[PDB]
Amino acid sequence: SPMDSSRRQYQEKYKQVEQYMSFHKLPPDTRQRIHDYYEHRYQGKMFDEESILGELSEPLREEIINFNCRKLVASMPLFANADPNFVTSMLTKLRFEVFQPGDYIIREGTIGKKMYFIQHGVVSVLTKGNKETKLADGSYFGEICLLTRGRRTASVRADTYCRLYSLSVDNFNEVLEEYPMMRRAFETVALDRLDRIGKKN
Amino acid sequence: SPMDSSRRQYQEKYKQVEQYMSFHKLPPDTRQRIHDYYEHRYQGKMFDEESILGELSEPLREEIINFNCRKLVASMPLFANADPNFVTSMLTKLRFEVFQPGDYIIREGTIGKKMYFIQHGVVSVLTKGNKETKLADGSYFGEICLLTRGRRTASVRADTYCRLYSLSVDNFNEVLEEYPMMRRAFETVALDRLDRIGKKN
Amino acid sequence: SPMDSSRRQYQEKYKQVEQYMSFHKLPPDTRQRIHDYYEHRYQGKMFDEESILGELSEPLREEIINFNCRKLVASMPLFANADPNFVTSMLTKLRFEVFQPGDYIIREGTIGKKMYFIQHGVVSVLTKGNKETKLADGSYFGEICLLTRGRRTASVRADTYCRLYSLSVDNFNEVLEEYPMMRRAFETVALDRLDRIGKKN
Amino acid sequence: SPMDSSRRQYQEKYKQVEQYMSFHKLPPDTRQRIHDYYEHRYQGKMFDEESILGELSEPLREEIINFNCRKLVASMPLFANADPNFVTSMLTKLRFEVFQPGDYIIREGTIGKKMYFIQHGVVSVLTKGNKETKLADGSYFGEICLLTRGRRTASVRADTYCRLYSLSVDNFNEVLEEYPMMRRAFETVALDRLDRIGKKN
Numbered sequence: 001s002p003m004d005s006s007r008r009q010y011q012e013k014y015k016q017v018e019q020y021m022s023f024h025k026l027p028p029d030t031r032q033r034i035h036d037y038y039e040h041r042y043q044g045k046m047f048d049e050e051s052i053l054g055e056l057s058e059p060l061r062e063e064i065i066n067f068n069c070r071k072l073v074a075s076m077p078l079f080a081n082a083d084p085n086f087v088t089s090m091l092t093k094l095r096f097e098v099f100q101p102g103d104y105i106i107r108e109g110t111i112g113k114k115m116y117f118i119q120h121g122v123v124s125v126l127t128k129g130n131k132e133t134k135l136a137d138g139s140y141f142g143e144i145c146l147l148t149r150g151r152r153t154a155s156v157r158a159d160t161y162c163r164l165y166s167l168s169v170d171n172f173n174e175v176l177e178e179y180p181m182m183r184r185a186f187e188t189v190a191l192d193r194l195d196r197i198g199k200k201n
Numbered sequence: 202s203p204m205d206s207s208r209r210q211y212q213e214k215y216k217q218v219e220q221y222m223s224f225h226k227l228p229p230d231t232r233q234r235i236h237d238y239y240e241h242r243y244q245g246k247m248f249d250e251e252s253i254l255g256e257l258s259e260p261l262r263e264e265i266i267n268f269n270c271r272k273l274v275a276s277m278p279l280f281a282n283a284d285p286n287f288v289t290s291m292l293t294k295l296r297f298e299v300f301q302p303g304d305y306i307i308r309e310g311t312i313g314k315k316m317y318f319i320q321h322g323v324v325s326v327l328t329k330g331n332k333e334t335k336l337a338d339g340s341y342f343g344e345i346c347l348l349t350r351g352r353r354t355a356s357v358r359a360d361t362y363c364r365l366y367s368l369s370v371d372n373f374n375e376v377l378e379e380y381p382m383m384r385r386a387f388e389t390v391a392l393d394r395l396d397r398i399g400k401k402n
Numbered sequence: 403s404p405m406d407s408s409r410r411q412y413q414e415k416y417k418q419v420e421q422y423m424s425f426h427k428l429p430p431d432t433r434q435r436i437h438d439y440y441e442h443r444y445q446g447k448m449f450d451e452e453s454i455l456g457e458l459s460e461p462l463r464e465e466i467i468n469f470n471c472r473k474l475v476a477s478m479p480l481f482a483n484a485d486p487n488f489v490t491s492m493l494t495k496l497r498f499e500v501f502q503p504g505d506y507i508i509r510e511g512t513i514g515k516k517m518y519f520i521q522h523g524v525v526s527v528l529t530k531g532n533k534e535t536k537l538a539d540g541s542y543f544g545e546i547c548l549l550t551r552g553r554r555t556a557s558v559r560a561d562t563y564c565r566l567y568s569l570s571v572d573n574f575n576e577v578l579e580e581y582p583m584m585r586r587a588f589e590t591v592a593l594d595r596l597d598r599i600g601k602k603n
Numbered sequence: 604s605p606m607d608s609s610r611r612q613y614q615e616k617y618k619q620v621e622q623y624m625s626f627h628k629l630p631p632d633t634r635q636r637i638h639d640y641y642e643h644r645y646q647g648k649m650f651d652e653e654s655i656l657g658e659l660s661e662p663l664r665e666e667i668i669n670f671n672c673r674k675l676v677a678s679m680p681l682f683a684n685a686d687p688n689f690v691t692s693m694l695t696k697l698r699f700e701v702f703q704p705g706d707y708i709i710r711e712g713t714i715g716k717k718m719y720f721i722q723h724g725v726v727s728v729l730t731k732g733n734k735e736t737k738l739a740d741g742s743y744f745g746e747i748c749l750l751t752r753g754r755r756t757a758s759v760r761a762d763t764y765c766r767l768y769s770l771s772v773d774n775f776n777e778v779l780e781e782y783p784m785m786r787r788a789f790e791t792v793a794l795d796r797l798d799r800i801g802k803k804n
């Protein structure tokens with residue numbers, strides 16, 4: 001129902017957005033991109049996700065988000081085949097993020113402070129002077145910078161609208177100091193991914 | 202009265218919860234668990250507890266929560282027989298938490314960042330290959346990890362609905378750097394509890 | 403006017419308080435103490451002081467609070483005779499606090515993380531085995547712990563309702579690392595105050 | 604429209620301000636200065652700028668503020684001629700601030716934790732015993748303290764109403780650890796500016 005505080009919320013908040021756009025005299029293409037983002041991202045409803053989750057117990061918090069990430073976990077070998085407690089620990093630190101076609105999720109050469117899991121959408125991995133590798137539902141990227149603490153080893157550009165979950169470097173490390181055999185699984189893959197664009201260490 | 206902003210609040214916030222459940226298409230058992238949590242936890246009323254407490258002076262803050270924790274303090278030798286200022290200092294750092302039958306309050310082997318005091322309810326302490334010890338009103342658990350900085354030495358599972366107060370590791374230490382003879386009282390007991398599931402140090 | 407959002411606010415928020423008191427079944431003396439605090443502290447009006455101040459420029463922020471602390475600054479030699487920029491720097495870090503007759507603003511032997519300036523009210527300084535010194539409008543206390551980093555050297559108990567400004571240890575140090583000749587003025591006095599209850603260093 | 608939640612917001616919030624002024628019995632000149640600030644700063648509309656921006660993706664966040672800072676970037680050689688990614692990185696860390704004629708944006712001799720970019724307005728740089736240098740649209744100041752970590756090397760006083768963007772020292776460094784050749788461009792200029800008021804290092 002539209003009388004749901006959560007749909008009425010979406011409408012009022014989108015109203016705020018329109019006036020901000022109007023105050024700053026944003027171009028029409030930029031206004032359309034935002035409108036479209038707002039629909040893909042929120043889908044007519046706004047929740048105070050983390051305050052609602054925050055009001056619950058941790059087991060319910062865990063149970064809920066496991067339920068929500070069922071396809072993501074089962075599509076992703078790293079997750080699907082791991083200890084659930086590690087999986088849960090990751091899952092509860094993730095932040096949902098949407099991107100639009102054309103967006104540079106990551107720029108090569110920059111400093112990186114999050115990695116990403118692809119729930120839905122297709123993305124492009126772009127190195128200066130290699131062909132282009134694609135990643136879709138059930139893969140992740142942006143992990144290399146977190147392991148090395150250097151710079152981004154590629155740009156990553158959205159082909160489609162993307163529904164992603166991001167993980168901060170501090171959470172990534174926190175989960176890996178508690179689950180160290182999982183560090184290796186990211187390393188193996190990260191080396192393989194470097195090898196192929198002809199790089200090392 | 203239901204016209205009390207605090208009952209009207211409970212109703213509106215529970216409405217939010219229902220719509221969140223609906224958006225994410227949660228199973229019925231999971232919806233019932235949450236409904237039931239919400240009733241045991243809040244009891245038809247929501248307060249901004251720490252903002253109301255935050256608006257008061259510290260002595261009133263102290264007086265109030267002492268009043269509220271009277272049965273807890275008097276049921277618990279560690280508290281009942283201590284210096285009230287230490288007791289007050291602990292009490293003002295606690296966070297109320299509810300759990301449901303079946304919940305793993307603590308999982309063995311994980312990293313722990315809070316201990317717990319049992320105001321109401323009964324819990325089960327579960328070590329791989331020992332019998333099962335029970336704890337109820339007036340005991341605490343989860344202190345061992347805080348003292349050692351290692352991992353959880355047992356799982357702890359709720360038998361009943363549990364009304365608990367949690368204490369973070371940083372607060373635990375803060376209160377113990379100011380009240381060091383109380384460190385010992387946790388140590389003595391913590392050693393005794395290790396002894397019995399056949400462990401050490 | 404009572405239609406002022408700030409008086410209507412005081413009334414609604416005090417309503418919240420009454421229901422909290424009712425939920426937790428607070429004794430009548432404790433309910434009266436809180437009622438009375440709420441009137442002395444807020445005086446029928448609630449402002450989001452720091453959000454309103456936060457929306458302004460720093461010079462206006464500074465100008466305002468200087469205006470408000472005029473009697474305090476001019477009653478207090480340390481402030482009255484200092485560099486205004488130091489005074490301003492202190493003033494902008496203060497937090498208004500009210501206390502009631504009987505309250506222990508400070509307990510001897512505890513760890514201290516704020517000092518206090520007396521705008522209005524009279525207080526009692528109590529050392530085990532000395533007579534009792536009184537402080538009123540235009541003095542400060544609780545500075546000794548901040549200078550030494552040891553424990554409280556006295557209890558301090560409110561005789562009257564007290565209108566005070568508190569300063570955290572971190573702000574105290576921040577202002578003193580920038581204004582080091584003012585450190586001395588607190589030291590001189592702090593030594594004199596120790597001398598008299600027969601203590602040192 | 605005035606029915607826009609953002610204009611209604613400005614009106615309600617300005618109402619709050621008036622009552623605060625009234626409670627604290629502010630002088631008329633001080634009330635007029637604030638009224639006038641509120642109009643130059645907000646212009647009849649209040650947005651939750653960073654919450655709206657916070658709800659969007661980073662690329663949209665970036666695109667928007669680039670659009671908004673177009674004249675600032677193109678008026679300022681340091682920005683205009685740099686790598687956009689550095690520019691974007693700076694731009695997204697800026698905080699809009701307004702000042703009034705007469706205001707001391709910076710006092711010589713104090714500790715500094717932000718620098719400033721002038722979008723609109725004219726300012727005065729004042730050293731004890733030199734003539735006075737003026738800066739307007741398209742310059743910046745307050746960078747010297749950030750580079751040296753010493754004290755302010757001048758007072759800076761607003762001649763006109765000023766629309767400025769501030770950058771905190773921590774953000775300044777963060778952007779410069781990632782873009783180190785830009786450190787030099789601030790150094791060169793900062794040395795030149797010292798030279799001229801007859802100073803060094």
Ligand SMILES: Nc1ncnc2c1ccn2[C@@H]1O[C@@H]2COP(=O)(O)O[C@H]2[C@H]1O
Pocket residue numbers: 106112125133135140141142143144145146151152153154155156192193194196197
């Ligand atoms: N060959 C590959 N296949 C898939 N992904 C690949 C490569 C090479 C790099 N990458 C990703 O690019 C990302 C850019 O940010 P990163 O933090 O370097 O992590 C990198 C990897 O996740």
Ligand SMILES: Nc1ncnc2c1ccn2[C@@H]1O[C@@H]2COP(=O)(O)O[C@H]2[C@H]1O
Pocket residue numbers: 307313326334336341342343344345346347352353354355356357393394395397398
């Ligand atoms: N024998 C015992 N009796 C009661 N409680 C016991 C034992 C042994 C461990 N424990 C608790 O299990 C908890 C698991 O988390 P912990 O942080 O290891 O603290 C432990 C104790 O509080």
Ligand SMILES: Nc1ncnc2c1ccn2[C@@H]1O[C@@H]2COP(=O)(O)O[C@H]2[C@H]1O
Pocket residue numbers: 508514527535537542543544545546547548553554555556557558594595596598599
């Ligand atoms: N002789 C004195 N006259 C006035 N105030 C005095 C003394 C001795 C201690 N004190 C205050 O007690 C305070 C207790 O907290 P403190 O942080 O030790 O600072 C002390 C002084 O401000």
Ligand SMILES: Nc1ncnc2c1ccn2[C@@H]1O[C@@H]2COP(=O)(O)O[C@H]2[C@H]1O
Pocket residue numbers: 709715728736738743744745746747748749754755756757758759795796797799800
């Ligand atoms: N000669 C100059 N021309 C323009 N600006 C000048 C000078 C000398 C100092 N300054 C500015 O004063 C500022 C005071 O704070 P600061 O942090 O020292 O940075 C200084 C410079 O930005």
